[PDB]
Design a binder for this molecule. Structure first.
Ligand code: XA8
Ligand code: XA8
Ligand code: CL
Lengths: 306, 306
């Protein structure tokens, strides 16, 4: 037993990271097949980044302006194009360590692993959720741009995030691997604000199930509720609405524990109204909303990723 | 910026995990060079595990009783010996993916990454601390025995933990890679108790520095204290004594932030006496003691692990 914030194993992604340099800007790229993908602001000086014209910077560049390194090997670039906010560099060598992979655009409330990299080299791995306001709460220093977010599905890496920037509040914003931002952000160094955040209700319920599985059961009550009556109460605490889709997704936890979803909702309703009454759940004094139902099943049933 | 519980990248370890089977007991092993290391209770039936005689079980086994698989390949075992609570299996094939490595015995208060595995296959990665009572708070289901804990130092994996069991309180116990337990536990299915835990003071101070680096500064006060006077107060809250060694180790954080260690101790003293006054630090309502000073520098300066 036990419950921990767990990242996917990172090996399959570690063998795809390279260092991309253009002029004196250096960041990370992801080498899959004969293509390297990286943030397009690799073509900016830091002054350009205050107000960039990427198309105009890119025309002035040729293949030879891009230095791509994988450990000791330089990779000769033989083509380039821009897709939204991502730069695609065609190279003369396919990556032999390319895993089976897909590009995916994730939904608010879904989690992924981040492999934080500096100079093409992996530094660490952690879990993030895509917030309802389309930001993530990560850990990224200078050089971390181009670090990617991902999920593993057996042998297949789904890439879902590439890191670009940090907002004035300290949270993080990036793109899918087709270079489309999550949320209304642009790759320019100017003040921009995220929407106010909300709590991912389905994820709090999945954590309450994890808690029960792990023996923490003091918050369980004898009541049920209706979806409608739960959403009316929760709304005021800035919880996002729970839909019937979410109820269906929680069904496996429900069946594993023998506690109906609307029985758990009745427990959560009382926690929001009354507080935690000087008690913890899974060691935490606050409700946690960054585990998906899948994360809980994965961890509290034992699913692995060849 | 940002601060997250971060694991080392797991690739170097992922290529060392194999599945070991003996009879109808299956668990994980670590394949380095031509040796596989695994928990010795792989030779037990579940009935044996209630009260095992490992030496007597092992004499009855020969090399051919051990089935070791790496993905599709079976590895023929050509020798076996027991070292404390670990079983060493000599195999006919050296692991070509063996990283530079060392075996290390860690101290209470030190952190490591755990690669949780099932059937030789990696499931996930997380950070743990070795508690002062020599347990860890992990996440381990049936099949997870033989999962290892580790640190990376540039290119070198230091292996420090191999998972064996879970205690009646839900916390976890294991051995170093020479098969010596951390703490007074034995590999037998019988009631055993950990010492009462204590809080790792140096780690709470390193987290307070992380917090300051990340802009959370409300708990900073204008006072200093003496090491002696801090330890007198903290003792009563079941904080472990802060030594001059610990002060020296915190020096880098101190210099990065310009806040003397005994200035921070004066802040921590007031937090213990007065409480957190309905405020959080780095998002947490409780003090966190599972980041080492090194973890903080690593994450809030950007160190990577080729
Ligand atoms: C990223 O550019 C990078 O790693 N490198 C460029 C060469 C190496 C860098 C990553 N990073 C470092 C600063 C702390 C957090 C972080 O994500 N990203 C950036 O510096 C982007 C980049 C410029 C400005 N920028 C920002 O993140 C900035 N934010 C903003 O201006 C705002 F949107 F949030 F308001 C600063 C945090 C630097 C102020 C691009 C947006 C193109
Ligand atoms: C480990 O044996 C394993 O993964 N496998 C055996 C074949 C696959 C297993 C891992 N595990 C599964 C149960 C939940 C937590 C956990 O660590 N470890 C064990 O089952 C050990 C093993 C027996 C008994 N054991 C225990 O962990 C037990 N604990 C105790 O008896 C006590 F020390 F804590 F009191 C139980 C949790 C199973 C009660 C060995 C000690 C040899
Ligand atoms: Cl908390």
């Amino acid at each position: 037993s036990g419950f921990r914030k767990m990242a996917f194993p990172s090996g399959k992604v570690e063998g795809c990271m390279v260092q991309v340099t253009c002029g004196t800007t250096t960041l990370n790229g992801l080498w899959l097949d004969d293509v390297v993908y990286c943030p397009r602001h690799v073509i900016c000086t830091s002054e350009d980044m205050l107000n960039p014209n990427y198309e105009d910077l890119l025309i002035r560049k040729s293949n030879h302006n891009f230095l791509v390194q994988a450990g000791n090997v330089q990779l000769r670039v033989i083509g380039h194009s821009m897709q939204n906010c991502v730069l695609k560099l065609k190279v003369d060598t396919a990556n032999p360590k390319t895993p089976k992979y897909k590009f995916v655009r994730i939904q608010p409330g879904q989690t992924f692993s981040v492999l934080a990299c500096y100079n093409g080299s992996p530094s660490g791995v952690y879990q993030c959720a895509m917030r309802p306001n389309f930001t993530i709460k990560g850990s990224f220093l200078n050089g971390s741009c181009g670090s990617v977010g991902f999920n593993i599905d057996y042998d297949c890496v789904s890439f879902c995030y590439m890191h670009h920037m940090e907002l004035p509040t300290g949270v993080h914003a990036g793109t899918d691997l087709e270079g489309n931002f999550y949320g209304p952000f642009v790759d320019r160094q100017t003040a921009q604000a995220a929407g106010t955040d909300t709590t991912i209700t389905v994820n709090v319920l999945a954590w309450l199930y994890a808690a029960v599985i792990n023996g923490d059961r003091w918050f369980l009550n004898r009541f049920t509720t209706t979806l409608n009556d739960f959403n009316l109460v929760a709304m005021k605490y800035n919880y996002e609405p729970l839909t019937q889709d979410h109820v269906d997704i929680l069904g496996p936890l429900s069946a594993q524990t023998g506690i109906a979803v609307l029985d758990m909702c009745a427990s959560l309703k009382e926690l929001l109204q009354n507080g935690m009454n000087g008690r913890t759940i899974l060691g935490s004094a606050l409700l946690e909303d960054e585990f998906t139902p899948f994360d809980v099943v994965r961890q509290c049933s034992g699913v692995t990723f060849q």
